[PDB]
Short mmCIF file of C-alpha atoms and ligand atoms in Angstrom, two decimals:
data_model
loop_
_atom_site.label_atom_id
_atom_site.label_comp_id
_atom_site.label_asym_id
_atom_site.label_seq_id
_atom_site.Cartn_x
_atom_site.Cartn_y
_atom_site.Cartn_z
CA UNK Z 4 -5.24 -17.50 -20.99
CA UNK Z 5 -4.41 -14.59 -18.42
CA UNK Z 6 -3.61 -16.06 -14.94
CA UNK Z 7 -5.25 -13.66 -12.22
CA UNK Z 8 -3.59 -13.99 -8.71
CA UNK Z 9 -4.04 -12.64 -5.33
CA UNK Z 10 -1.92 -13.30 -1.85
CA UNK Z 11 -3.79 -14.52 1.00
CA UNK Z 12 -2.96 -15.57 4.18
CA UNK Z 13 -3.53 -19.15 5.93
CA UNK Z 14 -4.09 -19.58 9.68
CA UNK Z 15 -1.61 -21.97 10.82
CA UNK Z 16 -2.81 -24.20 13.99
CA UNK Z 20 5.02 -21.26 21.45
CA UNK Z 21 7.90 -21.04 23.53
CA UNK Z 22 8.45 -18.55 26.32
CA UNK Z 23 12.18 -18.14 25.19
CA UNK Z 24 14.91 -18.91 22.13
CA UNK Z 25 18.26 -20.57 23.29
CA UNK Z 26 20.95 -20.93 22.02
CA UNK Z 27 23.73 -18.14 20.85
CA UNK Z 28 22.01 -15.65 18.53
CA UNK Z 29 23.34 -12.86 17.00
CA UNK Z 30 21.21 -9.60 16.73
CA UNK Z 31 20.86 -7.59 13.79
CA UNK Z 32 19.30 -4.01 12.68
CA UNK Z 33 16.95 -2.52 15.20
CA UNK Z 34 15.51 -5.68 17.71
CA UNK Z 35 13.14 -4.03 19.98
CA UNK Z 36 13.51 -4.42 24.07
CA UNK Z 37 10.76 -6.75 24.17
CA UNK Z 38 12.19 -9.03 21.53
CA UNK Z 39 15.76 -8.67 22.57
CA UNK Z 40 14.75 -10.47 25.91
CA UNK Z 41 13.96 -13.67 24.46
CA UNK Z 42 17.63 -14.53 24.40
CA UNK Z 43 20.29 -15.02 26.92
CA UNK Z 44 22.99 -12.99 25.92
CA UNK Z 45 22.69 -12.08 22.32
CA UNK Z 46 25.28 -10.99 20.94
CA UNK Z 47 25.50 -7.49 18.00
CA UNK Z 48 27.75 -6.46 15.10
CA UNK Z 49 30.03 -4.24 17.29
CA UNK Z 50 30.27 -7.89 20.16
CA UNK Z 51 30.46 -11.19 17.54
CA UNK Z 52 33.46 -12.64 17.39
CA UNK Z 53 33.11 -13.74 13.70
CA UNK Z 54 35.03 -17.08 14.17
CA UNK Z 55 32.16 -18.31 16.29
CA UNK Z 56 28.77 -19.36 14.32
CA UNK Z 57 26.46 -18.05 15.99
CA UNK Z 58 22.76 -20.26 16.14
CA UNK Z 59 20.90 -17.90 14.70
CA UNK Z 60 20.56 -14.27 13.09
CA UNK Z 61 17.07 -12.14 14.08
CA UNK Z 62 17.27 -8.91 11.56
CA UNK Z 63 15.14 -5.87 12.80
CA UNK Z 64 14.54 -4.32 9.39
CA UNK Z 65 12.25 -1.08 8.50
CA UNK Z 66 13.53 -0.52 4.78
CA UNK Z 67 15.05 -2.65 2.61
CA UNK Z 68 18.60 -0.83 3.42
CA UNK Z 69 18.43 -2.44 6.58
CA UNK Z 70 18.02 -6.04 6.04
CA UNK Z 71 20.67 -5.56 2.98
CA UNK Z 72 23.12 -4.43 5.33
CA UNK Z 73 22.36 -7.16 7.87
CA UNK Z 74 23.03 -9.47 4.66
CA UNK Z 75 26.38 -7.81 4.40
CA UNK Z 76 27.63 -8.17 8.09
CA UNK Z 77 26.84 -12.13 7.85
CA UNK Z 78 28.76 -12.64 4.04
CA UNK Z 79 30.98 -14.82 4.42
CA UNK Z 80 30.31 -15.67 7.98
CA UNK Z 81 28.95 -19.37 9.00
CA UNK Z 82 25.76 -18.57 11.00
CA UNK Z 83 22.46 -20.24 11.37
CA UNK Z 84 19.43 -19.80 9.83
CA UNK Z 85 18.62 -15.32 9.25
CA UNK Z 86 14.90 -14.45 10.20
CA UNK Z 87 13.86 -11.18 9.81
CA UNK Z 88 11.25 -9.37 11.34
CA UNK Z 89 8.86 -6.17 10.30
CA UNK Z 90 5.81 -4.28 11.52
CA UNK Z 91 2.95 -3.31 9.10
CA UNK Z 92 5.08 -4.72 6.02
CA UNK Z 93 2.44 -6.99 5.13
CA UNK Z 94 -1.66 -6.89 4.86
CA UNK Z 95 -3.12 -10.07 6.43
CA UNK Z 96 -7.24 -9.08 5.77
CA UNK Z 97 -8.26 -9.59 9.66
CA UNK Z 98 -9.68 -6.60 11.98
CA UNK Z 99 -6.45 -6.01 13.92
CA UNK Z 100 -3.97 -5.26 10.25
CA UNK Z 101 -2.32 -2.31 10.74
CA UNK Z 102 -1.89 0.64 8.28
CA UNK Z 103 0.34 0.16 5.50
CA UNK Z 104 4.11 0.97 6.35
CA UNK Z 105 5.05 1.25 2.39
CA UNK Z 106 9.50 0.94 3.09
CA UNK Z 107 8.95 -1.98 5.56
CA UNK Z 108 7.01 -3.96 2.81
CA UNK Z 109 10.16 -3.52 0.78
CA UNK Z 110 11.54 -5.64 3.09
CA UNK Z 111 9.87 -8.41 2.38
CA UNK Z 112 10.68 -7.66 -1.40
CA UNK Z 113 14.25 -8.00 -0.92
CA UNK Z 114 13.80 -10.95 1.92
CA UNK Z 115 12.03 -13.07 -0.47
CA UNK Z 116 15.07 -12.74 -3.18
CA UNK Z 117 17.44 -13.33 -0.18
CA UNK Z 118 15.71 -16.72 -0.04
CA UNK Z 119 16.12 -17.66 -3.50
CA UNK Z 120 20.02 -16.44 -3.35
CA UNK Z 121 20.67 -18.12 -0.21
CA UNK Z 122 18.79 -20.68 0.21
CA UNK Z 123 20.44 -22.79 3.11
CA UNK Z 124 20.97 -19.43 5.32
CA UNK Z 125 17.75 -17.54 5.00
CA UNK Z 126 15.47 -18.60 7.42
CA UNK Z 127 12.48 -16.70 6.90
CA UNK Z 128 10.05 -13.45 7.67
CA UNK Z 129 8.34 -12.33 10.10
CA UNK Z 130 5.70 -9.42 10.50
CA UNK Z 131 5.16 -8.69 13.97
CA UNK Z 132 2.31 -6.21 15.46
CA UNK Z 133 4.30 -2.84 16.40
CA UNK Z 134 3.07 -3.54 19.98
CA UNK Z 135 4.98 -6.65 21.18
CA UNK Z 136 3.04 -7.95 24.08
CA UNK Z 137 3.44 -11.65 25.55
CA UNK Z 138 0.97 -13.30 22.91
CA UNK Z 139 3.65 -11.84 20.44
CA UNK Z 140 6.91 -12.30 22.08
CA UNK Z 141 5.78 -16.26 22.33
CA UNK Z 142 4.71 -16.93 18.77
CA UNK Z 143 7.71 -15.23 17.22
CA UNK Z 144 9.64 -17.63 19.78
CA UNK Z 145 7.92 -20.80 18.98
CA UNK Z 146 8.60 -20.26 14.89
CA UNK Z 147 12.69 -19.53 16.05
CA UNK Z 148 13.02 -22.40 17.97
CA UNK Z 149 11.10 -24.79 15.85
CA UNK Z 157 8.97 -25.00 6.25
CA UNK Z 158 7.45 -21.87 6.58
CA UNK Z 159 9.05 -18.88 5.83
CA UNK Z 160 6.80 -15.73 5.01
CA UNK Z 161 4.66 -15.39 8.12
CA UNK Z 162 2.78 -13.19 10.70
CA UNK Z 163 1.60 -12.74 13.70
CA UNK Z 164 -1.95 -11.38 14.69
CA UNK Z 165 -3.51 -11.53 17.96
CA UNK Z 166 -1.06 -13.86 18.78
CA UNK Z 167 -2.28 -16.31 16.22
CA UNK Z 168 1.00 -17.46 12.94
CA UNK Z 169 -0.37 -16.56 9.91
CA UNK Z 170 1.66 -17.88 6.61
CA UNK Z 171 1.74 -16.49 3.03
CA UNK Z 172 0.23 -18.02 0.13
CA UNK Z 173 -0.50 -17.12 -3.75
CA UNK Z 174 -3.53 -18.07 -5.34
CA UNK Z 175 -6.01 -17.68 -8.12
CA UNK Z 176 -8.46 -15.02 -8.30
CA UNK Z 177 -11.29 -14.61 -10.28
CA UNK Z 178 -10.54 -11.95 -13.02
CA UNK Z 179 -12.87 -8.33 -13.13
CA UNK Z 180 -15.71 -8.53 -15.82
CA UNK Z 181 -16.22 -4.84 -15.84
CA UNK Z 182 -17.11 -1.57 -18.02
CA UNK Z 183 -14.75 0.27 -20.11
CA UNK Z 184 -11.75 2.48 -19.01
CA UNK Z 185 -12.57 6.08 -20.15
CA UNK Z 186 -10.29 8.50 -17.94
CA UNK Z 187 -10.87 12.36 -18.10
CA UNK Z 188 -9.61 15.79 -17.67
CA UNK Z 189 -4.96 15.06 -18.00
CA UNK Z 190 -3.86 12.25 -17.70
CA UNK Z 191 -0.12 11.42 -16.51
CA UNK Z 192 1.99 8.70 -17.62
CA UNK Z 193 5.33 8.34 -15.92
CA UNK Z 194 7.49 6.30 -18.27
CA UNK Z 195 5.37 7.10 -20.44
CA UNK Z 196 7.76 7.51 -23.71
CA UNK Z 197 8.89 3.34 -22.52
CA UNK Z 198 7.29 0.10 -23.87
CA UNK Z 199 4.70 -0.48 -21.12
CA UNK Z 200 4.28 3.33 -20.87
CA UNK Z 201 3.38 3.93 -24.78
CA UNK Z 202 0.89 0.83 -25.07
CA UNK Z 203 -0.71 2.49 -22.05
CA UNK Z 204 -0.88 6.17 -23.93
CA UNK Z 205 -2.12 4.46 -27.06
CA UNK Z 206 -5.01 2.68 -25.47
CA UNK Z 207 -5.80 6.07 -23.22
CA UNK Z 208 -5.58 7.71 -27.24
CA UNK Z 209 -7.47 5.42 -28.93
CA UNK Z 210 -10.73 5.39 -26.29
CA UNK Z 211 -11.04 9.21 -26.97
CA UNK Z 212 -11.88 10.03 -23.79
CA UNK Z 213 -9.24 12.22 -22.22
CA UNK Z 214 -8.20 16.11 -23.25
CA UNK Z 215 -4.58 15.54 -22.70
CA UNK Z 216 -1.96 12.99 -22.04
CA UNK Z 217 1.54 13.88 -20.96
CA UNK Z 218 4.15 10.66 -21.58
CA UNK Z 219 6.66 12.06 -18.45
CA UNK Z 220 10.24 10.21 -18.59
CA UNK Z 221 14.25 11.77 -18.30
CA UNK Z 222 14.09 12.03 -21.94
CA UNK Z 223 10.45 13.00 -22.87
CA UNK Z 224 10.50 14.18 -26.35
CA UNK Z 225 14.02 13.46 -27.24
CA UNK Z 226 13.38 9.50 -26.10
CA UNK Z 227 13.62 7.17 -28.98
CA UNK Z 228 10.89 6.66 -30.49
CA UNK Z 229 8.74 9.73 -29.02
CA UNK Z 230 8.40 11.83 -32.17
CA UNK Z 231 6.27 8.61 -33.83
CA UNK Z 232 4.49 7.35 -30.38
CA UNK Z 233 3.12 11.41 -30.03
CA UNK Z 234 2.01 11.56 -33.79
CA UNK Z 235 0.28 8.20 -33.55
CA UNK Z 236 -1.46 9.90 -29.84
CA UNK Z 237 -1.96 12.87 -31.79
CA UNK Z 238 -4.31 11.50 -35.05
CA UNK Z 239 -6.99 10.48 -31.84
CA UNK Z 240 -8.17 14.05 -30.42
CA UNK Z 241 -6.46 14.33 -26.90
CA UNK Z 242 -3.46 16.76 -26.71
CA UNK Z 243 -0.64 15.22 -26.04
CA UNK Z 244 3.12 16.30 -24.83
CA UNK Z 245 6.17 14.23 -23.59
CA UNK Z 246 8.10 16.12 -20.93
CA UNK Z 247 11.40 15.82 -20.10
CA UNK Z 248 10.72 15.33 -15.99
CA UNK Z 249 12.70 12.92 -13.21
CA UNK Z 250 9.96 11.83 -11.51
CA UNK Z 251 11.66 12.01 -8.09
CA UNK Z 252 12.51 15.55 -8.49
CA UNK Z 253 9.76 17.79 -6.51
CA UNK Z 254 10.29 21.19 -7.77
CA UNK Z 255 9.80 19.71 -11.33
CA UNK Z 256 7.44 17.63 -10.49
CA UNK Z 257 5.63 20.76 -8.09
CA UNK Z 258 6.11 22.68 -10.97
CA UNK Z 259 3.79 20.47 -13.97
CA UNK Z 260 1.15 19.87 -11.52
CA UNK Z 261 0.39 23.21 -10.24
CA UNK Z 262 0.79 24.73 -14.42
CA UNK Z 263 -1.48 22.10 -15.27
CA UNK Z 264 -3.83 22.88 -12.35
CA UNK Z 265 -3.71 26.61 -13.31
CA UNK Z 266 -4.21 26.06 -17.03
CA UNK Z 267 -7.72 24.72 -15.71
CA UNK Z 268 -6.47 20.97 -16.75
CA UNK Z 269 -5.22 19.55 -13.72
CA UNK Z 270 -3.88 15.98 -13.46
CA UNK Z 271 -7.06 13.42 -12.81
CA UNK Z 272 -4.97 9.53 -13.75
CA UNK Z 273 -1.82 9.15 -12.91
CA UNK Z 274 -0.07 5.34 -14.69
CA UNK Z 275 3.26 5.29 -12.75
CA UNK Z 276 5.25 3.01 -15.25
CA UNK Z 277 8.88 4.93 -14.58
CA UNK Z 278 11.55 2.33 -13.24
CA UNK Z 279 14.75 0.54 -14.17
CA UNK Z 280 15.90 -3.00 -13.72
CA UNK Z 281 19.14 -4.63 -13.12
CA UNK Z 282 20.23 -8.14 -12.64
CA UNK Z 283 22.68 -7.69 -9.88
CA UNK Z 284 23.11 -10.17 -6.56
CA UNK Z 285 22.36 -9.12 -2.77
CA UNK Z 286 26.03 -9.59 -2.46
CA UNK Z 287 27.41 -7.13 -5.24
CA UNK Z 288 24.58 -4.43 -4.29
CA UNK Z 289 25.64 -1.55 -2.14
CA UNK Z 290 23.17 0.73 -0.22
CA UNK Z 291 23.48 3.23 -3.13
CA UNK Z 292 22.78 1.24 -5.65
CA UNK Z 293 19.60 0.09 -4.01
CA UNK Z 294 18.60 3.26 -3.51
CA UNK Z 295 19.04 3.86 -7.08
CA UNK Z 296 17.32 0.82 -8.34
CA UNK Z 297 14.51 1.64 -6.46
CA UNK Z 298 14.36 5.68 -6.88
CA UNK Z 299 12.36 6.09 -9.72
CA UNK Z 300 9.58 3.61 -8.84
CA UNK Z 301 9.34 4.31 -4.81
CA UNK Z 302 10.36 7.89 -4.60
CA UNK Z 303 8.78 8.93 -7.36
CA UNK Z 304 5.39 7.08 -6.30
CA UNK Z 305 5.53 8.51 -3.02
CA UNK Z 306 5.81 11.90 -4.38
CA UNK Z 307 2.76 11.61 -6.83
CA UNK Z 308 1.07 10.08 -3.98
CA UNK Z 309 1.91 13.33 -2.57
CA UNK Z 310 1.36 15.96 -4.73
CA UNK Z 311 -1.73 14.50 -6.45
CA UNK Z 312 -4.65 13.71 -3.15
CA UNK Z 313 -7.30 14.05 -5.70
CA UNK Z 314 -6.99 11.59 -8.30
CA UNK Z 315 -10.21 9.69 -10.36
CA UNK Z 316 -6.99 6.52 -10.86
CA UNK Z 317 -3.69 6.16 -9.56
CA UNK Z 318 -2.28 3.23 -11.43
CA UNK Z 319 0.71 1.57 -10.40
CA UNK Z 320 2.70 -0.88 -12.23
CA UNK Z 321 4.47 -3.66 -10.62
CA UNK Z 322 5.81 -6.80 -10.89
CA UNK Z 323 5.85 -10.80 -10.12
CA UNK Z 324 9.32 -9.86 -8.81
CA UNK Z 325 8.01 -7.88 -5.79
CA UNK Z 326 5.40 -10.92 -5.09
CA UNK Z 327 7.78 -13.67 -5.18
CA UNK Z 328 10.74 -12.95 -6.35
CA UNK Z 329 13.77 -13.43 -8.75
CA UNK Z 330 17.64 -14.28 -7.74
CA UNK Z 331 19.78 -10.99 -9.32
CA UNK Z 332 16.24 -8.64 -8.50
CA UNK Z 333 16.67 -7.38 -4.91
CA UNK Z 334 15.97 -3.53 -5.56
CA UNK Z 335 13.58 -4.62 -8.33
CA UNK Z 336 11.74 -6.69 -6.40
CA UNK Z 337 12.00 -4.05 -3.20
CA UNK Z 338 10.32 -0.93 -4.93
CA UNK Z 339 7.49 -3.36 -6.65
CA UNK Z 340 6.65 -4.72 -2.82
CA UNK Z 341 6.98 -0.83 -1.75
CA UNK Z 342 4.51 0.20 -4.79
CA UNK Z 343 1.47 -2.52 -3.89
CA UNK Z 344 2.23 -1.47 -0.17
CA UNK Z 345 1.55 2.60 -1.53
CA UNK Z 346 -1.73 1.25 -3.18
CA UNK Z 347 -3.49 -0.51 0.33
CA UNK Z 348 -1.92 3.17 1.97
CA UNK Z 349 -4.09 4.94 -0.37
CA UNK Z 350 -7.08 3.41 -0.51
CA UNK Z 351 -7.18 3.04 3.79
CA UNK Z 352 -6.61 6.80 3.28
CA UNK Z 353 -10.23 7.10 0.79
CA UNK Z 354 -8.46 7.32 -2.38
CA UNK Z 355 -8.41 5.17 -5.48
CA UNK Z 356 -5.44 2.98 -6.52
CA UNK Z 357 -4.40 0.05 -7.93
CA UNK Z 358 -1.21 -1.79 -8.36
CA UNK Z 359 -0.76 -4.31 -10.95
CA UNK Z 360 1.78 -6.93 -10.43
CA UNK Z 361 2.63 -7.60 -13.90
CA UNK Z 362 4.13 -10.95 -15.31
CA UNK Z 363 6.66 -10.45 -18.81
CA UNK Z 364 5.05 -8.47 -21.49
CA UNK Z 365 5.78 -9.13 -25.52
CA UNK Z 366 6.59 -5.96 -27.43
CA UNK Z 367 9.22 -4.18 -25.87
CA UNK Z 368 10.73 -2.51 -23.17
CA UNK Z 369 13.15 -4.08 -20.13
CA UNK Z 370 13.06 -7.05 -21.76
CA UNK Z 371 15.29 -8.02 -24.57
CA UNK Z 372 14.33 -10.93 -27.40
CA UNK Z 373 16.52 -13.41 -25.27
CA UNK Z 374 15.08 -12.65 -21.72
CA UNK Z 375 11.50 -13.70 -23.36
CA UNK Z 376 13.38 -17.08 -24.38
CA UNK Z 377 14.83 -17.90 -21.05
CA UNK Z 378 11.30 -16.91 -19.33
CA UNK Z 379 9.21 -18.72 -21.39
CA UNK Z 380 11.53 -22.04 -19.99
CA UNK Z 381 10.73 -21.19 -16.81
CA UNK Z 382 7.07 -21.55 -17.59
CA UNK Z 383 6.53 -17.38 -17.98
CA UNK Z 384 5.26 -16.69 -20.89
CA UNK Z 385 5.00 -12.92 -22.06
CA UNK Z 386 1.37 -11.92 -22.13
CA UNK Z 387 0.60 -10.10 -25.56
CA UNK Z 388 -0.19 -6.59 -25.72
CA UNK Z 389 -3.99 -6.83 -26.12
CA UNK Z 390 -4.46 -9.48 -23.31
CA UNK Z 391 -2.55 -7.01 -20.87
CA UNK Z 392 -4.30 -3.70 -21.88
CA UNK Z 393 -7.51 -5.56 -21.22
CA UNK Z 394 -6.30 -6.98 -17.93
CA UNK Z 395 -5.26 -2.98 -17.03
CA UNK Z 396 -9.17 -2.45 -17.56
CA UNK Z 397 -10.31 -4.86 -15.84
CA UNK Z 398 -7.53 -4.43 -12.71
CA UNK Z 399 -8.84 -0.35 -12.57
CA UNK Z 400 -12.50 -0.42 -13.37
CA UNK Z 401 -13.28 -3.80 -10.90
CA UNK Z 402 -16.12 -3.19 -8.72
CA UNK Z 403 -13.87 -4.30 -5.70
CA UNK Z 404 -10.60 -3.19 -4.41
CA UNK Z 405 -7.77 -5.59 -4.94
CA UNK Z 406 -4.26 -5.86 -5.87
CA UNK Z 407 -4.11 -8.16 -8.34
CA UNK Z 408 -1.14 -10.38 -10.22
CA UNK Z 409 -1.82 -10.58 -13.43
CA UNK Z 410 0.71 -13.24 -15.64
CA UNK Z 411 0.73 -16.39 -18.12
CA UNK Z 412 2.35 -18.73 -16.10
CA UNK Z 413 2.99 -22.80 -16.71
CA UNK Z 414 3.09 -24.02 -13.76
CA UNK Z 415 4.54 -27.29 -14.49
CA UNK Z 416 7.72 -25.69 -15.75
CA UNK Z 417 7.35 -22.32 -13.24
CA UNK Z 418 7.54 -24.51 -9.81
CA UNK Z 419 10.50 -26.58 -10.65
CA UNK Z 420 12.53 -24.06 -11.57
CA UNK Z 421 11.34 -21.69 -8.83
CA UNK Z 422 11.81 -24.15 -6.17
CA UNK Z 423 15.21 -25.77 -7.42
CA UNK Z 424 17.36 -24.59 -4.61
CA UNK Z 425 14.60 -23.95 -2.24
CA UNK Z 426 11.13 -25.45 -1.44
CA UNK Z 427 8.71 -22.78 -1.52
CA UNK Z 428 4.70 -23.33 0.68
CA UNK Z 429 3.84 -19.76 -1.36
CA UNK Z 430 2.62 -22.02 -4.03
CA UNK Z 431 1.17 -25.07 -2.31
CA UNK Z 432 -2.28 -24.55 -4.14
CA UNK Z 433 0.00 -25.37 -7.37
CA UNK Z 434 1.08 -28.30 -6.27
CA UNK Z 435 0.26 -32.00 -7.63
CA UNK Z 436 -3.51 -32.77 -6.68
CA UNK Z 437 -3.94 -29.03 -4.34
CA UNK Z 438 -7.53 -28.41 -4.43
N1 LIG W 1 8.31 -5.08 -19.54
C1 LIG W 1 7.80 -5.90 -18.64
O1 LIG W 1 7.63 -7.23 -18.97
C2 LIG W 1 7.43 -5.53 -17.26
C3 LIG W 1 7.35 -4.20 -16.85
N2 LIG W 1 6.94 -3.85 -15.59
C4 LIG W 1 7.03 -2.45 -15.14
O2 LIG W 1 6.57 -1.60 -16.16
C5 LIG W 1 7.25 -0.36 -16.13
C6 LIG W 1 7.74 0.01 -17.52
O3 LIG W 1 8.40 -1.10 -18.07
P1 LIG W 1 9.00 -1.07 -19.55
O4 LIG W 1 8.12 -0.30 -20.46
O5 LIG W 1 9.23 -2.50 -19.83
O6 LIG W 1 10.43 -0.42 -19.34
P2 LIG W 1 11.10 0.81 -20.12
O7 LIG W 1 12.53 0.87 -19.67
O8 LIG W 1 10.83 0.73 -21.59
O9 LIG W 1 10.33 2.08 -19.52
C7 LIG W 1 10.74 2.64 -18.29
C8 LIG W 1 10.52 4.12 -18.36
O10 LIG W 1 10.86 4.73 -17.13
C9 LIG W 1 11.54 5.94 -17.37
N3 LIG W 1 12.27 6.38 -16.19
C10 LIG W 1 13.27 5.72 -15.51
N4 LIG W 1 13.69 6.49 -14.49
C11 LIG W 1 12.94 7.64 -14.49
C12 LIG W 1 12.92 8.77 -13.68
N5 LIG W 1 13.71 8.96 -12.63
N6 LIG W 1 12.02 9.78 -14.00
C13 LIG W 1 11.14 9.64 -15.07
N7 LIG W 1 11.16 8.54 -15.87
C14 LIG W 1 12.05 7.56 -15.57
C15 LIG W 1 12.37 5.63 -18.61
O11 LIG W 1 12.67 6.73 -19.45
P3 LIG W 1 13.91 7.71 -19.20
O12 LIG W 1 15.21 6.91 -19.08
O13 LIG W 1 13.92 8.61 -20.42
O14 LIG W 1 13.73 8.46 -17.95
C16 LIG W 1 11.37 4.80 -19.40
O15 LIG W 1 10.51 5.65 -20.18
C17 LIG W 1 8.39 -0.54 -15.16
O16 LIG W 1 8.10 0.14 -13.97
C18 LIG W 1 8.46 -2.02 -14.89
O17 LIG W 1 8.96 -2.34 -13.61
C19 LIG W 1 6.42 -4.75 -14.72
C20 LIG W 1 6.33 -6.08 -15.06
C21 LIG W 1 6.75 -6.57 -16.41
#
């Protein structure tokens, strides 16, 4: 059965300072810096003393990875980290989506997993610190939660939960539609169900390799039998003049771009400790740049589809810049929509038949109680995620939770999943 998910946000029921010896990290605003009596910075610690505590200012992921670099190998306390606009509580005062500070929290949350004794937590913070503020982030330093946030001076902690899944019409997009990745596993289901509804006039599979990719001279002939043109192009998806270039030859060809599916991305399985800054850029290019510049280019969509991942809502040890650009992509999705437009990002558990992963990731998975959803059951979960009556972004994955929580909690206890837990209501 296909598990539908949500985050949501519980209301938890304050000091005027933090003592102790902290060390400061990033960018800590005046207003926070004051909390401490003589913090000390990277450029001041001696690093033979521990000091009682990191605070991380972080606005991109880069940040709070090199933060994570100064303290390796260092005994500190616990490492809190706080953000503005990274996360979307649901109350009046949420500010606009800050898309590279909710990358952030991607990368935090594997920090957590990786580290489990020396992360202490997150933090989102309004952008204005006033008193109400400077107390509540105080009173969670001084004193198990660890994916918070403060509004109106009220601590607000992260959960996941079931949602109800979308009973909806069919998906029938129109006019060209653009699917980035689209010559890779996820990407070619997605172009054979667009094919098969008959709908569309054209659908261009966009990846490094378009038509020489393997496999792209069968997936286009099986598109091609339905009645929708169809093309792979050989585009990066971060570059703008290429990119520049397709839209505006579609738009003049009187077949501009009306979906975008944004499935282009890579993975690696590579620790917080062995990843530099330019490798984290490059894990996260394709999926973050590349979103940001469709988001761009392309104002007037009918869809913009994004596919993430479970990894960017709670995380996987070895997934930093994986899990980074899927936080950054379901961040891009609340932009758009506060900005009128449609979009939708799907956090996607393991799918069966093909792709990133390999016969013996879907064996080690399925032990830790993720089981890859079958190609039919995630098509019509796609559907139902773009054609619900209600804007959402949902997280959509077969998970056993008797097998996922011990495993995901091993090193670390995690209150994301308390509903899970034995008798949660
Ligand atoms: N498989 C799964 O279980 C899961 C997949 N996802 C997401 O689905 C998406 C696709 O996954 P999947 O089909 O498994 O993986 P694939 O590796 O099969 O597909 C990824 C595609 O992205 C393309 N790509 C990478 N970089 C660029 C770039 N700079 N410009 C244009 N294209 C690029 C690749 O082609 P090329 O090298 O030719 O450029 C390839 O076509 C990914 O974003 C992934 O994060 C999410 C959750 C689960």
């Amino acid at each position: 059965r296909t598990g539908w998910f949500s985050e949501t946000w519980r209301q938890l029921g304050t000091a005027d300072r933090v003592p102790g010896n902290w060390l400061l990290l990033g960018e800590v605003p005046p207003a926070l810096g004051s909390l401490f009596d003589d913090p000390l910075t990277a450029a001041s610690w001696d690093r033979s003393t521990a000091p009682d505590g990191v605070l991380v200012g972080a606005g991109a992921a880069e940040d709070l990875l090199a933060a994570l670099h100064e303290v390796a190998g260092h005994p500190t306390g616990p490492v809190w980290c706080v953000t503005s606009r990274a996360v979307g509580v649901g109350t009046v005062d949420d500010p606009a989506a800050d898309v590279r500070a909710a990358g952030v929290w991607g990368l935090g949350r594997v920090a957590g997993l990786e580290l489990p004794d020396r992360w202490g937590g997150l933090v989102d913070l309004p952008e204005r610190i006033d008193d109400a503020t400077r107390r509540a982030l105080a009173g969670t330093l001084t004193d198990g939660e660890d994916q918070l946030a403060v509004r109106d001076g009220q601590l607000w902690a992260r959960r996941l939960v079931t949602t109800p899944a979308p009973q909806t019409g069919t998906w029938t997009p129109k006019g060209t539609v653009l699917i980035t990745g689209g010559t890779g596993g996820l990407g070619g289901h997605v172009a054979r169900r667009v094919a098969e509804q008959g709908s569309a006039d054209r659908i261009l599979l966009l990846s490094r390799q378009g038509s020489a990719a393997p496999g792209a001279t069968e997936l286009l002939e099986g598109i091609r039998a339905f009645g929708a043109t169809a093309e792979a192009v050989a585009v990066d998806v971060t570059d703008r003049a290429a990119m520049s270039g397709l839209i505006d030859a579609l738009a003049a060809e009187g077949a501009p771009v009306r979906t975008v599916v944004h499935a282009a991305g890579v993975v690696r399985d590579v620790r917080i400790a062995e990843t530099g800054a330019e490798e984290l850029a490059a894990q996260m290019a394709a999926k973050v740049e590349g979103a940001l510049l469709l988001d761009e280019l392309l104002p007037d969509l009918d869809d913009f589809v994004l596919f993430s991942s479970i990894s960017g809502i709670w995380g996987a040890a070895g997934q930093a810049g994986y899990a980074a650009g899927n936080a950054c992509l379901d961040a891009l999705a609340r932009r758009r929509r506060e900005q009128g437009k449609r979009a939708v990002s799907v956090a996607w558990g393991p799918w069966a038949g093909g792709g990133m992963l390999t016969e013996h990731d879907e064996r080690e998975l399925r032990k830790r109680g993720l089981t890859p959803l079958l190609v039919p059951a995630a098509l019509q979960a796609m559907e139902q995620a773009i054609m619900s009556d209600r804007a959402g972004d949902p997280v959509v994955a077969d998970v056993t939770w008797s097998r996922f929580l011990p495993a995901f909690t091993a090193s670390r206890p995690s209150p994301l999943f308390g509903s899970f837990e034995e008798k949660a209501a």
